[PDB]
Amino acid sequence: KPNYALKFTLAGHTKAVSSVKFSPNGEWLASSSADKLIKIWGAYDGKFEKTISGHKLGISDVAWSSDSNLLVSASDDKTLKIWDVSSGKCLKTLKGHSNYVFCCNFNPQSNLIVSGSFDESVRIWDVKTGKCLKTLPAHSDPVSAVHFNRDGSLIVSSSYDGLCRIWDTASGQCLKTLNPPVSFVKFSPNGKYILAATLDNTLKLWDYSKGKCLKTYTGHKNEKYCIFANFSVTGGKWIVSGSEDNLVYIWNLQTKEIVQKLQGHTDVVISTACHPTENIIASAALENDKTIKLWKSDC
Numbered sequence: 001k002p003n004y005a006l007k008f009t010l011a012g013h014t015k016a017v018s019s020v021k022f023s024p025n026g027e028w029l030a031s032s033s034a035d036k037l038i039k040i041w042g043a044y045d046g047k048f049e050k051t052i053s054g055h056k057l058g059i060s061d062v063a064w065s066s067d068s069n070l071l072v073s074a075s076d077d078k079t080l081k082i083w084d085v086s087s088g089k090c091l092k093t094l095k096g097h098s099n100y101v102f103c104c105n106f107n108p109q110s111n112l113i114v115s116g117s118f119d120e121s122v123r124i125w126d127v128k129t130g131k132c133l134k135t136l137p138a139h140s141d142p143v144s145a146v147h148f149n150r151d152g153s154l155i156v157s158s159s160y161d162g163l164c165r166i167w168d169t170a171s172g173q174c175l176k177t178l179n180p181p182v183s184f185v186k187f188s189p190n191g192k193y194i195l196a197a198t199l200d201n202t203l204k205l206w207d208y209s210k211g212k213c214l215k216t217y218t219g220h221k222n223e224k225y226c227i228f229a230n231f232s233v234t235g236g237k238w239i240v241s242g243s244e245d246n247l248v249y250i251w252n253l254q255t256k257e258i259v260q261k262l263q264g265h266t267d268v269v270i271s272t273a274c275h276p277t278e279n280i281i282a283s284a285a286l287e288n289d290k291t292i293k294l295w296k297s298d299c
C-alpha cells in the first residue's frame with residue numbers, strides 16, 4: 001500500500017481548477033481553470049512559476065508536448081490554443097469546433113493534437129500549421145475525453161452517449177466501439193488496456209484487443225463530473241482517480257482493493273495526475289476549494 005502524504009497546497013486560481021498535468025520531463029505541473037488561465041508550478045517544490053493567458057472563457061483541459069516545451073488548452077471559447085511555455089505566447093489558435101472544447105492531447109511525436117467537444121466531434125489538428133486535418137463524427141453527445149495510445153496510431157474517445165470508441169489516427173476510421181455516460185477514458189502506458197469511467201460510480205479496465213472488461217474499481221463517488229483517472233506506475237501499480245466526495249482514491253490495479261484515500265480537498269477532486277518518474281500525485285478541486293495539492297509516497 002502507498003503512503004501518499006500532503007506536501008504542498010498550490011493556491012492562485014480564482015475559480016474551479018479543471019485539469020492538472022505533469023510535464024513529460026517531470027519538471028513542471030500545468031494547471032488550467034474556469035478562470036481562463038493556465039498556471040505553471042514547480043513539480044518538486046510547488047513554487048508558482050507563471051500564468052499563461054489569452055482564452056476568452058474558461059479552460060477545461062490542458063496537455064503537454066513530449067519535449068515539455070508546448071502546451072495545448074481546450075476552452076469554452078470554442079478554440080484550442082497552442083502555447084510556448086518558456087515565452088508564455090500563444091503560437092496558434094485552433095478554430096473549427098462549434099461548441100465548447102472539453103478535452104485535448106498531443107500524440108507522442110507531438111506533431112498532432114486531438115480534441116473533443118460539446119459539438120459531438122473529435123478533431124485532429126496539425127501542430128505546425130494550426131489547421132484541422134480531420135473532423136470525426138465521433139459521438140452523439142458531448143465528448144468527455146480523447147487520448148492517443150503509446151505510438152499515436154490509435155485515439156480513444158468517450159462520450160455522454162455511453163460509448164467508448166477507438167479510431168485509426170491515420171485514416172480517421174472507427175476500429176471498435178466497446179450505457180451510462182462515459183466520463184473519461186485513457187489508454188494504459190503499454191496501449192493494451194483502456195481505463196474508462198462511467199457516471200455510475202464505476203471505473204473499468206478494458207482489454208482493447210479482446211474488447212472485454214478485465215477489472216472494475218468501485219467505492220468512490222462519480223455521478224456528475226468528468227474526473228481524470230490515471231495509471232500510477234512509478235512504484236506500486238495503482239489506479240488513481242478523483243471523486244465527488246472530495247477525496248483522491250487509489251486502488252490496486254490487479255486486486256481492485258482501495259489502498260488509500262487522500263483527504264484534504266473541500267470540493268470535488270476533478271483532476272489527478274501522476275508524476276512520470278517519482279511517486280508524486282497532483283490533485284485539484286472545484287470552486288469551493290480552487291487549490292491544487294501535491295502528495296508524495298515512498299512506494
Ligand SMILES: C[C@H](NC(=O)c1cccc(CNC2=NCCN2)c1)c1cccc(Cl)c1
Nearest residue numbers: 018060061102103142143144160224225226
Ligand atoms: C457537467 C459536467 N462537466 C464536467 O464534467 C466538467 C466541468 C469543468 C471541468 C472538468 C474537467 N475537465 C475535463 N474532464 C475530462 C476532460 N476535460 C469537467 C459534464 C458531465 C458529462 C459530460 C461532459 Cl462533456 C460534462
